[PDB]
Amino acid sequence: NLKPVDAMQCFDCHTQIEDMHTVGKHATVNCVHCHDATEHVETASSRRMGERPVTRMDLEACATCHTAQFNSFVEVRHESHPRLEKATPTSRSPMFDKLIAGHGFAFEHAEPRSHAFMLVDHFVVDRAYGGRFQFKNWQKVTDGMGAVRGAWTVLTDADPESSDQRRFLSQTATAANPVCLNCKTQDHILDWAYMGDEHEAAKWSRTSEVVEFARDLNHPLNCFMCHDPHSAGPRVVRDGLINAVVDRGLGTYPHDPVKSEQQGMTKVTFQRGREDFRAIGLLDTADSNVMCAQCHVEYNCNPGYQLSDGSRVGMDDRRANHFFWANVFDYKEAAQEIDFFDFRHATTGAALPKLQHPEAETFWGSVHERNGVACADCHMPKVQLENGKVYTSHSQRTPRDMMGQACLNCHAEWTEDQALYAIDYIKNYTHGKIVKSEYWLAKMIDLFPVAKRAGVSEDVLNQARELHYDAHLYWEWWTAENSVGFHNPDQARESLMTSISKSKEAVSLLNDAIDAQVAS
């Protein structure tokens, strides 16, 4: 049984915590729920930590008083098909392997499944750790609660004796690095300096051995990623997001200065040895658009190359942890502003960006976003109970599972079937354009070896490579983005038509150049 500690004693040294804790809705929640600080209190001074207190980061620390939210979070949506590869004819990107050739995603890229699995899925995907980590057996893939209890309760490491990234199976990659983990867990929140920069007080950083870092991490999507444990108020903890919104002053809604001001973020910095160490972003309001944008964004979390000179940009560089915080039509400019690209296409040699799940940036400017709707309205609605205390569902899943609460409450003119039909109209239309964009990209890509072998000049190949960048960007955004156009159908339409235009331009350029070589 827990025994309370005297928080006044802590507050003597922890003024920032005092100011948060005493004012919020956790003012009566004793520190012992999450911290074991006995030896810390015996040894600390006002500027030196002394013995490190233990801080609980398990979600059960919150589930004791918030079982409803915890249970809704950990529910596994069995209809979210697991380990479903996107590069197949029946999934999101039928020609993905040809289009992404040269990139680590060619090894495996599955559709997302329920949040409980995020950390385990990150660890076991074929592109991440060379196949080092596996579930203990193939039955464990169902065990959401187990994954939440801790990744290492359900996973095995092929070689606990080594800590290097290497292939354990031939068709795997070792793309994982420490930045990835920031969107899977915040178990490292006290051990990682802001942005993963080198820091005396940080156990882990962008340049750490990711296998060793992995072994230290257990829990997915900690509840405190969106809720300050001290004030219980809304926040974000993701460094990349704070950096974009606050440090770079882009604001929470870069396209709406007024909304950015009303629904803003306040950066709170915590120090170690009186030197800035870590930060959180306190939100003005409980704005799930910004909470979900901690992870559902396009980002860099990887080494890459400079657009200017093609030189390597390694994990040690700040750019290896970066939120572009730019919609699809501002993205090329945002990548130019940091002088960065992700990979060279294996066939065309083009410098290309790699886009990932840009839901937050896609949502900006959509009809729903403009009308003050937020992710949670459709994906974590309040529960409707005939007789019950209302709480917010933490199931984070498609509104198809709860259309009454997620759509039909606003769309009184529709039945569930009508609303589903509206969704399907958009997704079907968008998917048709994605498929057409891929057809044209693939047609362009296939001409590169023919052009090279026909003696087409490097100048013409480079012209086509520049078009490839744009054709790729304006296509890939939409296979990366999870709503298949729903979050912003007009933007998807304009973008995908732009992709096709670019590819058609490249096809015509290469075809003409090949024919001119043949004629000469």
Footprint of ligand HEC on residues 30-89 (CB under 6 A)?
A: 31, 33-35, 55, 57, 59, 61-62, 64-66, 69-70, 73, 77, 80
DSSP states of 82-127? TT-BSSSTTSS-TTHHHHHTTSGGGG--BPP--GGGHHHHHHHSTT
Please report the beta strands in 320-382, taking only residues with DSSP state E, as ranges in sequence order.
Answer: 322-323, 343-344, 351-352
Q: Is the dihedral of CA 177, 273, 29, 282 positive or negative?
A: negative
Residue 227 touches which member of Ca ion, a copy of itself, ligand HEC, none, C-beta under 5-8 Å by kind: ligand HEC
**Interface stretch with ligand HEC, choices 264-272, 293-301, 309-317, 494-502 (CB under 6 A):** 293-301
Q: Is 125 one of the binding residues for ligand HEC (CB under 6 A)? A: yes
Q: Please name which of 31, 43, 25 lies closest in space to residue 4, comparing C-alpha atoms.
A: 31
Question: Phi and psi at residue 164, in whole multiples of 5°?
Answer: -85, 150
| Residue 301 marked in a binding site | no
**Interface stretch with Ca ion, choices 37-45, 70-78, 346-354, 468-476 (CB under 5 A):** 346-354
The one-letter amino acid code at 28 reads: T
| CB of 402 or CB of 471, closer to Ca ion | 471
Judged by CB under 6 A, the chain residues 138 through 197 that form the site for ligand HEC are: 175-176, 179-180, 182-184, 189-190
| CB of 163 or CB of 482, closer to ligand HEC | 482
What gap in Å lies between CA 106 and CA 108, rounded to an integer? 6
| Residue 66 marked in a binding site | yes
Among 174, 302, 488, 495, binds ligand HEC (CB under 6 A): 302
- Kindly compute the dihedral angle of the four CA atoms of residues 503, 507, 510, 513, in this order, to the nearest 10 degrees: -130
From residue 265, alpha-carbon distances to 252, 261, 302 in Å are 7, 9, 26
Residue 223 touches which member of ligand HEC, Ca ion, a copy of itself, none, C-beta under 5-8 Å by kind: ligand HEC
CB-CB contact of 327 with 491 (8 Å) = yes
Residue 294 touches which member of Ca ion, ligand HEC, a copy of itself, none, C-beta under 5-8 Å by kind: ligand HEC
What does the angle CA 285 – CA 194 – CA 131 come to, to the nearest 5 degrees?
Answer: 105
Judged by CB under 5 A, the chain residues 227 through 246 that form the site for Ca ion are: none
Judged by CB under 8 A, the chain residues 32 through 91 that form the site for a copy of itself are: 32-33, 60, 63-68, 70-71, 74-76, 78, 81-85, 87-90
Judged by CB under 6 A, the chain residues 396 through 455 that form the site for ligand HEC are: 396-400, 423, 427
Q: How far is the CB of 323 from a copy of itself (least distance, A)?
A: 29
Judged by CB under 8 A, the chain residues 438 through 467 that form the site for a copy of itself are: 439, 449-450, 452-454
Q: Please name which of 100, 97, 79 lies closest in space to residue 89, comparing C-alpha atoms.
A: 97
Neighbour count for residue 489 (Cβ, 10 Å): 18
| Residue 140 marked in a binding site | no
Number of residues that bind Ca ion (CB under 5 A): 2
* Per-residue tokens: 467: 């078009």
Q: How far is the CB of 61 from ligand HEC (least distance, A)?
A: 5
| Residue 407 marked in a binding site | yes
Using CB under 5 A as the criterion, which residues of the chain lie in contact with Ca ion when the complex forms?
Answer: 354, 356
